[PDB]
Amino acid sequence: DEADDATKKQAKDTEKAKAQVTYSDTGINNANELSRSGNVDNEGGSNQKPMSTRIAEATSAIVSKHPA
């Protein structure tokens, strides 16, 4: 993902066809790395729903009104 853009920028910096200093498709097996993704929040949960929406529903669960 994020190494393909770096290799493409590497090719554009030298204006050549294929890049020479590659960051992806190396010999190193790097399957256990993590990038700082936008999927996790600061707790550890996921972000299927945004945080302010979660808070808004968590406090709109219990509100009261005037009696009829």
Add this chain to the structure above:
Amino acid sequence: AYIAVPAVVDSRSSEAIGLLESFGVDANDVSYQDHDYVVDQLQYMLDGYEAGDVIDALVYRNWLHHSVYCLLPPKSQLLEYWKSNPSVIPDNVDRRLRKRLMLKKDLRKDDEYNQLARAFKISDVYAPLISSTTSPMTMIQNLNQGEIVYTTTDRVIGARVLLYAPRKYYAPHSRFNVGTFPSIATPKCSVMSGVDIESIPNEFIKLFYQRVKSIHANILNDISPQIVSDMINRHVDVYRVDVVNVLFEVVDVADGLRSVSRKLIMHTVPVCILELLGIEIADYCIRQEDGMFTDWFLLLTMLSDGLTDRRTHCQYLINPSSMPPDVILNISITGFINRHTIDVMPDVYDFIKPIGAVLPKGSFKSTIMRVLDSISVLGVKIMPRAHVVDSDEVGEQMEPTFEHAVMEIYKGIAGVDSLDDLTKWVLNSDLVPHDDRLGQLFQAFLPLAKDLLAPMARQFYDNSMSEGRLLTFAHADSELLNANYFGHLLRLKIPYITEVNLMIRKNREGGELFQLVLSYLYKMYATSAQPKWFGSLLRLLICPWLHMEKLIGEADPASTSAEIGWHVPREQLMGFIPYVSIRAPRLVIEELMEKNWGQYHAQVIVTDQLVVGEPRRVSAKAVIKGNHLPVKLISRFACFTLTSKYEMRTGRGAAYNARLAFRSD
């Protein structure tokens, strides 16, 4: 992000279709890929190799690592192109071989060139190289590395193929991307789960998805169209109709309490009819004061291609009667689970010619000939009663008619007289026939069906081909085949029990059980071909016309309409009969003014009196000589009527070598 949908996606066309709201997803950032060429490339790919290697190779390919092929002439034209005007020889070449190539007028006499050329390989210079012996797995696995791949052959699968030499030597992303092949190489790639593998209309996408879900089903990141609609937010063709299924259940509210009896499903109702009938997830009474079905549930069951339940999975034919072993009277609709498109125009309908629909004996004809006569979407009539021939009519112009002719078959069986005794003899208390006795009756029925009915049917169908193009019902399959019927042969059935229809209707003119026996005779007279779900004709009949008025509507009646018909020259002693009638938008009829309507010739016999209060008319007879009319000659964008009688706007008339003439405004 990359999700996969079960339909062919091109970037420029499926955006105009929309193609994602069509599955049920409300929706920029959604960029479409062009997977148009990979399906034809797959079709060329499958005839050489097996299936599993090709599919299991294509599965492991991401659609974000952008790349391309390269195809080169094999060896002799490869060295000849380097011999030619460009010296574009790469640096991988042999130091002696380029030196022998930079000279002039090389030939067979040069031993020093030929000795090195006979030991030269393409794999020395170009690496990685796809040869014809490589597996399809290693093609894609080598393709996912280095953004260009050199080949030798055309038969590759994946990205676009570009060529290396001139032909004289040969023999842009966004955040959300959709496609039609689920990738596996990324931990996150997704497949939609709207429709199953049984309703995918491409027959290569279906073959692909069955093999994907056969082995990789645990590791697919699976999502629903509702979750796709969550992730996104925070000319106009006819014969492409969205379809869904109705998940309902029959309820028995006797008094107070209600029970639930069955859990049914109704597979491919069109969405436009459900929108225009205005039905929702609520309860419905589907009977009238009589007990007849209330004219909309009847139409819903006549549009579908199936009705089964969900606990078992056998076919469920509902009871049309009101006798209660099982009466369906109340319906509770509970949802719509899959959604896809379908091409309403079938395969057998190629040339414009009459339609023979084969229905069984006790199918609902008296209701559908009332309903289809009373439909009008535009300034035309879709299917009037004057264009429909009953199954009854073919055997009635005879010394005593075919039903009464086989009514007196009882004279000839030992111990059988007084027809009630025959009907008691064949059927038991169950009204299921005995195995031998029905065939013993059939061996006397059959020469009356063949040697007596079929020549009259052949004569009658020639006459009906002469006086226009009509729609002919038929009882059995072989009734339209022993008589040499000309037209499209349609084998149909309805989702109802046709048997108990034969005991509801009185005024049957004979034995009320005798006509059930006569229905069994026709059911055994037909061949063993599978009928094809009357909704398969009714969607063709209704749904293109209803989709048409949403975009043709109120443009102008003068210049949306046009008609095809036969044209006689004016120089006659004492003219334009219509053949079809076409309604389309302005640009389509402007595209219909060309495509000349010659190379179509008839012989019109035109002699009759005025018959009705409409203006001057003569019921002519046209007999087409040449080839009949293709449908792609008309369009895919313009609806057209299917049936028409023949008349023109006193004196006499004779054989006229007519031609067609497209008129419009």
Add this chain to the structure above:
Amino acid sequence: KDWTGPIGEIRILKDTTSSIARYLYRTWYLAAARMAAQPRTWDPLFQAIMRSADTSMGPQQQVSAPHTLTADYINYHMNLSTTSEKVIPLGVYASSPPNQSINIDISACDASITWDFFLSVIMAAIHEGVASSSIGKPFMGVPASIVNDESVVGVRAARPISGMQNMIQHLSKLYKRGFSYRVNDSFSPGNDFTHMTTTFPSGSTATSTEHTANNSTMMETFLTVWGPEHTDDPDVLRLMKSLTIQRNYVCQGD
């Protein structure tokens, strides 16, 4: 009752049928299953060699291959009753004093077989004898495919098509409707039309071999099954139980 639902455009015949058509079914089924297991039908050179609408009078041969290819196996390996130069001593033996001979001729051999009894059972048998050996492997130019089924009444599923039976799928829809002819006689002007039949063309090549196979198969099931089940007079029974079509039956056409 003696059919199941469609596998695409083909209904299969259940073997618990009461009719005689299962003996027609098993010969074509065994024929397809034994021709598909041969090694010669799978190198691309022999497929190229065997590669090497309407019809009128003054393209069926691209898709109707395996019908002919399994007709040849019946004519030359299963029941060698066809003599397709040696016809003379056959009749000189058959005309001798101690033996008799029965001249059996089929009237209307072209109008004989249709989808009603023969072609349906044959295209159900060839679609099943082939799919064991050939699984996914394509033919000359037609690829593998898939089509839904309702073979068992329990469920329905996808069941990928081999590719050799893909021609059976595309070809049974041609046999299911009938043939289209076109005429124009020079002996009467203004006489030019088209016509729909169920009969076959007159003098083709592949229209002889499968008719001979269909002759010999029905004669064998006559002498085996229908014979003893429908007669008294055990002289007739003893006569029927003594002869088979390998020993005395010769057919070349109708």
Add this chain to the structure above:
Amino acid sequence: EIQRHITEFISSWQNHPIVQVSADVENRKTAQLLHADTPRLVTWDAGLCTSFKIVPIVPAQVPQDVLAYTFFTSSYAIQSPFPEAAVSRIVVHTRWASNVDFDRDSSVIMAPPTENNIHLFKQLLNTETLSVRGANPLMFRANVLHMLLEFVLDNLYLNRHTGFSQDHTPFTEGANLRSLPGPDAEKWYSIMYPTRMGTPNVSKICNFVASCVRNRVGRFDRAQMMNGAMSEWVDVFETSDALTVSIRGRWMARLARMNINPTEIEWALTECAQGYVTVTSPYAPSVNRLMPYRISNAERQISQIIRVMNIGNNATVIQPVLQDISVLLQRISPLQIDPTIISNTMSTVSESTTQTLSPASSILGKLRPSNSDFSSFRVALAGWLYNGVVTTVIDDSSYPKDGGSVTSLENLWDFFILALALPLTTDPCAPVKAFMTLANMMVGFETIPMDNQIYTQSRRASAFSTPHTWPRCFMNIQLISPIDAPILRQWAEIIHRYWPNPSQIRYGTPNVFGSANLFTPPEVLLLPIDHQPANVTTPTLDFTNELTNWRARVCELMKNLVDNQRYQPGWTQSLVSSMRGTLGKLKLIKSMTPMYLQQLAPVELAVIAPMLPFPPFQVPYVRLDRDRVPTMVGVTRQSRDTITQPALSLSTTNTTVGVPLALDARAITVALLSGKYPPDLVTNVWYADAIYPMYADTEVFSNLQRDVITCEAVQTLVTLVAQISETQYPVDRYLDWIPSLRASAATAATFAEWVNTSMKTAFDLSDMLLEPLLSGDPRMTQLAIQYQQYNGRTFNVIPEMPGSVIADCVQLTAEVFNHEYNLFGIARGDIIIGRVQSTHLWSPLAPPPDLVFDRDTPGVHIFGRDCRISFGMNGAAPMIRDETGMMVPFEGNWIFPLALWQMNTRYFNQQFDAWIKTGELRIRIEMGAYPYMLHYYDPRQYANAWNLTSAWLEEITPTSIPSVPFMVPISSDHDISSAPAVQYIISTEYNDRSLFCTNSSSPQTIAGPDKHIPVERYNILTNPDAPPTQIQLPEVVDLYNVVTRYAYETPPITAVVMGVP
């Protein structure tokens, strides 16, 4: 009966058979064996794990007179965790609040008990029940078993970690509330957290909520392993269902036992490759993935037994497998054809043009090459993996067609072809066919003594198939006389000395792949020929191995035959010299095929054999030993009469399995005489290039997943059938109080069809599970396999049945159902029909003990088999007779079985109902189990139950009974005036566990039956001294506990194990 015959026609239409396997299935067995699909094991549930929903029945009186509308929380639109209604009950509904990936197509969905739930108990075996209402009471146990099977199979999901959000209200102590996805999610929180609600009132909900422990809400435990990553698992307090939590915990335990991490995947794909390709696996802290693949050994062996039982004496299912392995050997083998080498070497044979015979040119017509000759060689090479089910023999047409004299030259070549081709085939009678091939050709030339008049010397050599048609003169070489049959004396010693020798090669990876073989140890394969591992990687032509020695000695036998003195003077010298030169050259032809079969083919068979859709199945090879030739490899699938031990019932209840298939002898010896290498072949480059695309697939990892379900459904079948029939396995029965019939073999077969249809509806399967066992007698099932040698000595394998999860969970659900039969809509005990007229407010699901009576009650008449009614004469009372022979009037307390009423439901109604309605008799009808409706009534008005109970009594049938109607009063919260009510049907046992709470939003319940919020369920809130994990699961279900929630990811194998091309 004109209208009635229509009902008979429809009722005979609707009884169609559900199973149509009447057509053949051996076109589908082949496709299943070559490619079987995987099941769907891991599926994620993002909702909350429950199956019981609390439904309101009767709404509360939200305006009234005695209490203002400003009291209730409903007036202020305050959301409450429980329905603020007058009567609330618990019903059962699986997967509400379940945003699953896809459903299992299972559902136990129940209507509230005021409606009719009879359609759940007529689903299975009521073909012959007429009415829409009503079900056969002899089918109740089987209906409940299928309902519990659906109820288990609908809960096989894994809990998903969604995401949290700390609240900002002061309702909690800053707790962390879960947020679950969906289109409309702002109303789940009131349901999901009962203790979050504020407490305004002295309503019963607010009396419950404020009497609990506060710090048991939301999150309380997480595992944070990395910065900025998903937490792997949390423990949350929320509304749940401890039965469902138990099921998903056991399912997670099974899938965690199946787990592997990619280090041993790297090791297994290295050992399976035998070093010819290497793969990698990273060295870093893991992101805690889940790849379920390691299974036990017995699960693999059982599926192997089922596949061997599938291929039964057919030879058209197993033929495409050998044809597949032919193409697979052809893809990676280095050897190729060279058809021109014989045509090149036979160009320098010295002979004369004057002769009519031509020994140089006869072999080229006898042995023509056609480039399609490896297609018949690689099948014989692939048949070495299967001798148990496949016995490759030489075709019938490859024999010399009734003998053939040795004076003939063409038959002399035909002997040479068979003598080279026979050691390659795995048929055990190959040496005796090789001997009798020569002994047929020498008749009247040299004679040897036979065994009988049938298997004589001129008897055809292809007719020796059984290992004791072997002649005595073959195994005693001394019986062949050295001076009257010297050439046969030679050929017998050549067979007994130079026939090849079996060996063993060690394929397989025992760690990740469960070894599939049986009667051989794991990690070994048996070859018919001998192998030696090569030391060089640049191979070159050598002459020292068994196949070249075999060819040389056959050539030297033919040299001694042409140099015999009875045989030479029939020829001329220019013909004898040409034949001797042809043989001396044909010995020293230069072909690579015997070297290849020695050194390289045993390596690449072991490379291929683990990665194979049908694993190897071998019994031991043997040369020439008569006493160790295997016959009758045979599987069993059932026991017999009363012998319940498989080792005893194995020998007489098996099915012999195996086929012969025919190959031609010409095409094998063309391959043996003509085969060469590439020009510069180097093996560590060639195999590393060839094997590399093969080891990127995962199809064997899918077959390992399918074997779980194939072993699992068998134990599920045994456990579920043993609850209705009498089996031999020790099982635990709980559902004996539910009545059922005496099941037969047809009933057991039908119930097992429903079992495996429901089994493969879930897990997303589409072909052929458990039908090989289903085809005969599913009551007594067992799985074993055996063969024997010629001397009657039998080996056998009886694999153990390993642990099953679904079979444990069904029994767990039955253990809960024994104490919570009420929630599934079933009552226990029996009913008592009698006129009870009072103004009291007790409920008929909990009657007072004054009204019931039993068999121990004094003065109660018991009725059994004998139902003989004497009529009344001249005003005397009619009488019915006792079990003890008495004769009593229509008065008092009676006890019936239900079947006695069902057999006489018309004749009893006219005699009894007018006395039950107005008179003074009360009938107890023993049933055991029954479903029930609940018709409520306003207790301020009159209410007669006769229109309900007469409609119940008149619908009783010898087939079916409808559900039993009751009349329960509606409880209120202020004082009401009472009206008399008449009711007729009451229960016997306690029957009121289904009630949840009455007058939920109200201070107290005054009139009618009351029940507070059940404290014994919500144990973690109400008991401050109980641990959070504790469940009292066999008694109650508690509706609230801690549930763990995982966030493991399931990547494919090729996303973590690369392969380094």
